[model samples]
Target chain A: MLILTRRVGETLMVGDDVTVTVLGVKGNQVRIGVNAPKEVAVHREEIYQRIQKEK
Target chain B: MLILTRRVGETLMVGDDVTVTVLGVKGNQVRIGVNAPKEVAVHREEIYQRIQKEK
Candidate 1:
């Protein structure tokens, strides 16, 4: 497995126009920000894990 | 189950010093940004799903 997937301050587009920002890293944790069309879904892993474990 | 868990533009500190942001919304989707200590983990649900499916 890769140790990291690093990027820069700018937005990284995926698919069409979804933008992801590699704001910076503090040590182990990487800060990210995403901007996308309203149709896209953006969420955190912990919350999503809760959702997955819900049902 | 809840329909939504809504917050505003202000940074929300969780646990000790983890901050989450609600930038804005459009139609049905909300925009977010997060800040936290290096020990915390942040990830995409789809990426997590891919990992779960792998192992």
Candidate 2:
């Protein structure tokens, strides 16, 4: 795993039309934030990955 | 590359706190949109991919 060190208010783009930001940090977890396009439902990965049985 | 057939407005959450959406479709091409955190700047891949290198 490639860990990154970013200050609060800094950002990173993993792909097109997306950005990740570090909101706050506690312990070893840095609280980050995100957003996405309209018409798209954004959710926690824990919610997404666990519910990918849409076959 | 795994392709999906999602109707317009259909959503896919790629991760925790993000979503990808299909806005429109064309011949073999789908136009989707995006968003990100406050400090993050979102852009079109045509614009993003072509403009990498921390400019």
Per-candidate DockQ values are 0.03, 0.06
Give the per-residue lDDT of model 1 (tens digit) for A1-55: 1112333322233211234444433333335545545665555435654685596
Error of 1 at B49 (Å): 29
DockQ measured for candidate 2? 0.06
Error of 1 at B47 (Å): 26
lDDT string for model 2 (B1-55, tens) is 1123234334444444544433433323334345545575444323455567557
Worst 10 residues of 2 chain B by lDDT: B1-10
TM-score of each: 0.33, 0.36
lDDT by residue (B1-55, candidate 1, tens digit) is 1112334443343222345444543433334455545664455434555577689
RMSD of 2: 15.0
Q: On a 0 to 100 scale, what is the lDDT of residue A19 in model 2? A: 53
| DockQ result, candidate 1 | 0.03
